[PDB]
């Protein structure tokens, strides 16, 4: 897939991503906070179509991501992120996608998710997270 | 003066500010780096005119600010920043303005100046700096 | 179990922990680096015996932990850490314990593991990690 790297910002206001209950996670675009103002980052699209879009608008700054988890599995022979669920201090969004494969979780006791990077082809290949106080 | 707060970014690519060899420092606008791309912040202008503009373009990222110093004094009864000099790992820019009053210096052994905030009326009233690794 | 919190230090020089190939992870004691000198933290022991001790001495500072993974499962009805493997930029230590249950992994692209906290009764109940630049 095509690699991407949003970099680091001051927080997260909204997350938009696609999913297919038959396959895996597709594209994604994040709206970060940048010193008090919304900042929409580059849209990272899937090479294909047929996904359902989910939009998660956080009640910034009172609401922030407290945990990220999901499953990684193989689709058409490619190892991709098949499901995602975001836990907030207010509520839980997900899971979305196929919860089959190897699970993973990143609970946070102290700190903030402040950026994303990764790779997307037909589906989300992999991703990493920026952390900060 | 009118207070301002640029917030924090990933670095500094260019600094633009005004000075009057008779009075003090005037307005200023900073071009920050934001995850590898130039980001021009709000222009913070003086309430008056008659200044000389100085533009400092840093050879980002090989060149970064290593020290900030200057003098604070009274002009027309107001306590303002009358002079500024920026020390880089490559060279020294300044001093600019009137080097009369109380000197101040912020040398940095490890770390980066990553943002500015302060207040400007007729002249630069005061400022603070964001620091980060 | 009894909760513990080593706090944060400047790095890690050595990790000592117990494991039982039949049950789960037992006690553990970490030797941190503190501004260039070894600092041995409190020994957090299991409520029982019958474990094998493993000592991982890192070639500090050239060698540092690059990834932590393992499995969490139930033993005698308690949910505990049953296995652990530490990936270093030099080599891999593990896995140790029973690799049965829910896997978890914490790969690090940039940053250092700089402290531990958690709970230990008969076995390691759970743990969290301190991260830092």
């Amino acid at each position: 897939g095509v690699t991407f790297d949003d970099g680091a910002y001051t927080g997260i206001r909204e997350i938009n991503f696609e999913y297919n209950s038959e396959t895996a996670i597709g594209g994604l675009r994040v709206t970060y906070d940048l010193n008090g103002m919304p900042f929409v980052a580059e849209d990272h699209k899937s090479f294909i179509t047929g996904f359902k879009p989910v939009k998660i608008s956080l009640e910034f700054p009172s609401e922030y991501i407290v945990e990220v988890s999901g499953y990684v599995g193989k689709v058409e022979g490619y190892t991709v992120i098949r499901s995602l669920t975001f836990k907030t201090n207010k509520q839980t969004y997900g899971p979305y996608g196929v919860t089959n494969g190897t699970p993973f979780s990143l609970p946070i006791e102290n700190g903030l998710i402040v950026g994303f990077k990764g790779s997307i082809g037909y589906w989300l290949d992999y991703f990493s997270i920026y952390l900060s106080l | 003066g009118v207070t301002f707060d640029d917030g924090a970014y990933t670095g500094i690519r260019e600094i633009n500010f005004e000075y009057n060899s008779e009075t003090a420092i005037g307005g200023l606008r900073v071009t920050y780096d934001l995850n590898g791309m130039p980001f021009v912040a709000e222009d913070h202008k003086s309430f008056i005119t008659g200044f000389k503009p100085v533009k400092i373009s840093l050879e980002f990222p090989s060149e970064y600010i290593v020290e900030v110093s200057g003098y604070v004094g009274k002009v027309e009864g107001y306590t303002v920043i009358r002079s500024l000099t920026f020390k880089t790992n490559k060279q020294t820019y300044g001093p600019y303005g009137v080097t009369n009053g109380t000197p101040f210096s912020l040398p940095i052994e490890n770390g980066l100046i990553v943002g500015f905030k302060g207040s400007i009326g007729y002249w630069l009233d005061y400022f603070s700096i964001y620091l980060s690794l | 179990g009894v909760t513990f919190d080593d706090g944060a230090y400047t790095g890690i020089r050595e990790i000592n922990f117990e494991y039982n190939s039949e049950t789960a992870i037992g006690g553990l004691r970490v030797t941190y680096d503190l501004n260039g000198m070894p600092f041995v933290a409190e020994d957090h022991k299991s409520f029982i015996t019958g474990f094998k001790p493993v000592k991982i001495s890192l070639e500090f500072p050239s060698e540092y932990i690059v990834e932590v993974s393992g499995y969490v499962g139930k033993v005698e009805g308690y949910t505990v850490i049953r296995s652990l493997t530490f990936k270093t930029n030099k080599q891999t230590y593990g896995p140790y314990g029973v690799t049965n249950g829910t896997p978890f992994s914490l790969p690090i692209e940039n940053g250092l593991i700089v402290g531990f906290k958690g709970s230990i009764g008969y076995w390691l109940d759970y743990f969290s990690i301190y991260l830092s630049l």
Binding site: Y126 | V114 | P107, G111
Partner: peptide, 16 residues
């Protein structure tokens, strides 16, 4: 050592 601010990055997840 340059003028770029460093960040703590955890991951990736997607090759497991």
């Amino acid at each position: 050592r340059n003028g770029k601010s460093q960040s703590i990055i955890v991951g990736p997840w997607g090759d497991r």
